[PDB]
RNA sequence: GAUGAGACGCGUUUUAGAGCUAGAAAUAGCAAGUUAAAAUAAGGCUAGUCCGUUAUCAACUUGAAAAAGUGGCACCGAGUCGGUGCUU
DNA sequence: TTGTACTGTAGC
DNA sequence: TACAGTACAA
């Protein structure tokens, strides 16, 4: 009657088992539908559900964000063309059309093949006069004569399309662009972060060293030689190496137990820093971001090398000089190679495949690969000294479009565009009428707090309009309601407190959150108040020596004090307090308790917004308290991220008996100390009661709102479905208790507790019909290790179901609390039939791989556009199949035409999924199938199970790919032998337990020679990999004499042959066995298709040999 | 630890940037190369400077969908479950 | 002309 | 890890 269900949730597996009060798994004759001969199969109430991991939305957001950027960039180009078209029509009728159809082959091109002028003579004249776009840009800046309108459009479109970054706010000035200024800023925060043993850099010249044209290591060494107190391996040298773009090791300087490294690579814009500051703390992030902006200063000064003259547009002239040096150095390299090393001349300049100059230009070889290829060549070749330093300084034969251009601010392109429009203002009146329009097209950026400019049809937009019309950059300021949109951004961006999920979290930099983390570290209150007022409110970093010298000896008059709470220095700090004291300089204003809301609203404003306008509006309310220079400075300050506690928790809720908040208890608790975890946990405090009341609020309400990765949510939803089907199996009877694995544990317990215990009374608040019991994995693992019921991951996926049954057994034994019970548990662990089910899931994602392949005559290339034939324009490859579809039809075959019936699978890809589901019959008719029988169309997702002769099971991975779907049910004594054979000298138990394991593995060593026969039999029956079987048998026979460790580890990798899933390449001692791929789905046309439920206890078997 | 907004720079793809000479040639020698346009998931309609890779998904019967419903028990054994006995 | 075998490919 | 490209058996 009464029964228990034990569960085991993982990221990719949910194992389940049903036990009785005698710790036995029941077995029932489950009915099976379908046209097969079998009507009922005996199945056991134990199994596991296997599924592909749940994915974070992050990659989908990266794609979504880029998808908007390309759209808005095309819209910018369209705005510029909209401005230009009316005047351009009387100059060239089909210029924009030619620029649109420039991608097309000449046969598909309606107009002339030359995009700019449409005549070959003028195009050749253009390319001779301006070999790059920057020559045209520099001329248009530096010429007063009337220029052609189309070249002006080309220059402005090149600057509007590729407009550079917005990281620097305001106009360009040396205070944030000249390398010396931000170098002094870097050493300023370097001194502020420690203030013990600082570095002082006053007489040094940064622009002489960092902007010098020299190799990077030599520049670093010279800068280190300018500072005798620091070295290259020092933390300052580490920071300067980051500024130079090297790969320094911060873990060495901060004594981390694991390697931590950073570099500002071409598409990792300091985002790797999370793994470092998760360990070393967030105090150093201001050091690293200043290093990043100093790096941007160094690159900007490097590529603006012509800024030594004010005579022209700096970036265009600098690219011109780079082109000139590239040409003059290239002809020298060609002569130097041809004169003295005629061999490999063709390899460098003609081959275009071996990373030469031809591979640098016409091939996919980067700058550093090209340098690495030719560096041995230049070491061998003579006369290369003046040219090799260009490799050592990364200046040799550089292109104009490179990864370093990400450091270019938008102000440079803005200045060049302004210079062009001011130079051509009188010649074209519509430039005078639309100078501000084009400058606004270049300089407009959608704010943080606005989001997508939608009209209700977006999941993501909170943007609120004040009018119903099209939004352009010119009329943006009078259409969006900024107050409503910014307010709506706050309502979304506030996180909620994990203790009280109704309540808004504080800013991380919030002053009360600083006081919290300080006082929580000291309690691990007159003395507390004196220490905080004397040191913490005076200095950023306080050590134990400062406490014993400046407080205990000075105030308490204690000569010798021993402190054990804190080792060296306090991790917490009042940094926001000292920051405010630096900016406002009216210290007593923060002493007034009334102003706390004003201060925390200010730091809330800076933690919300990044743009100047809304920040200016929100703090402008406080202008009657203070004014002028303090706003003028604090408008540049910003903060990032959020605390754990709500403002509603920390000082908001008051204990119902003591009349004190959490921070009130932290400040004073009488003659003894108490910490935050205890303040929540102590039953003497009503915080325990109030949190356990207020923490609780459909299944999706709990799953969507709770904190966790989509990977662990998937196991929770599947574990609820498994519970529902197991209740359905047992006559709708509920379990006596449900056992769960292991802070997510209390949310999983709430979901199952609330789905089972739906009844309540007037006096009983909750009737515990079912007791959801939570256990820790340490207990089950210790039970497994102590009593010889060992497990491995490599033999089979039966360990999930065995883990679930052990969870059930230990949980029931614990709530109720060595003979027949041990025999029962050993019989169940050696019990062969376990309902392993791989979840059949329609594949979703990108419908193909992202790499665009060149043109070819194959029909397998996917068209990148509707009118772009992939035989001519290239296209994508490797499409992803959402699901396969079993079709029977007639196919037109042969020159002498007849209609032959065929049955075959066809893969419906993701892009053809919707077109298939609108009309399957016409979609199949378009593929050549005619007389298609509609009712026999069977949808076959990924992991569809088929059964063939001798119990051979195959899982469908695609339309033309199968997978191994059988489990090797090796007996429990052999898995015990295998586990004890491995880990031979690392049990870390008693020596006697060690030796009773060793004689067990030794004197049954013929078990190994029997398990290899087990592998051979199982593989010959269901795997059909005979060549690999002979290979592994020969390798096992000729490595028989190698001892227990290596042999019984390589035989653990040997089960990769018999493991269900894709065939993977395992390895023996030395030999590596290539996988045997099942690239033929012809055999499952006459197999038995298996429709397994979530538990797999209910099946619907269709015999496909009776169809067609 | 979840989620979201705004931006940059590469990369790839086709085309434009007239290749020259010896050549019956399959080709050989030389010259040249750095840039730009267009696309960046096919596309969708409420046509927005929006949306399109996350989450959900065994089979059957109802239901536009949502959603609901659909499958006997005990014992003896074990090569992916078998056999025996009651029951409608 | 249709199936198999082996090796290579895949955005940041 | 499923698909692509080249290379053979009929």
UniProtKB/Swiss-Prot annotation:
Mn(2+) 2 binds at residues 8, 800. GO terms for molecular function: 3'-5' exonuclease activity; DNA binding; DNA endonuclease activity; metal ion binding; RNA binding. A motif (PAM substrate-binding) lies at residues 1075-1077. Its cofactor is Mg(2+). InterPro entries: Cas9, Cas9-BH, Cas9_PI, Cas9_REC, Cas9_RuvC, HNH_CAS9, HNH_nuc, RNaseH_sf. Changing residue 76 to A: Moderately decreased DNA cleavage. Residues 698-742 are annotated as: RuvC-II. Residues 1-60 are annotated as: RuvC-I. One of its GO terms (biological process) is defense response to virus. It holds the Pfam family Cas9_REC. Changing residue 68 to A: No DNA cleavage. Keywords: Antiviral defense, DNA-binding, Endonuclease, Exonuclease, Hydrolase, Magnesium, Manganese, Metal-binding, Nuclease, RNA-binding. Residues 841-1108 are annotated as: PAM-interacting domain (PI). CRISPR (clustered regularly interspaced short palindromic repeat) is an adaptive immune system that provides protection against mobile genetic elements (viruses, transposable elements and conjugative plasmids). CRISPR clusters contain spacers, sequences complementary to antecedent mobile elements, and target invading nucleic acids. CRISPR clusters are transcribed and processed into CRISPR RNA (crRNA). In type II CRISPR systems correct processing of pre-crRNA requires a trans-encoded small RNA (tracrRNA), endogenous ribonuclease 3 (rnc) and this protein. Monomer. Binds crRNA and tracrRNA. HAMAP family: Cas9 (MF_01480). This is CRISPR-associated endonuclease Cas9/Csn1. It comes from Streptococcus pyogenes serotype M1.
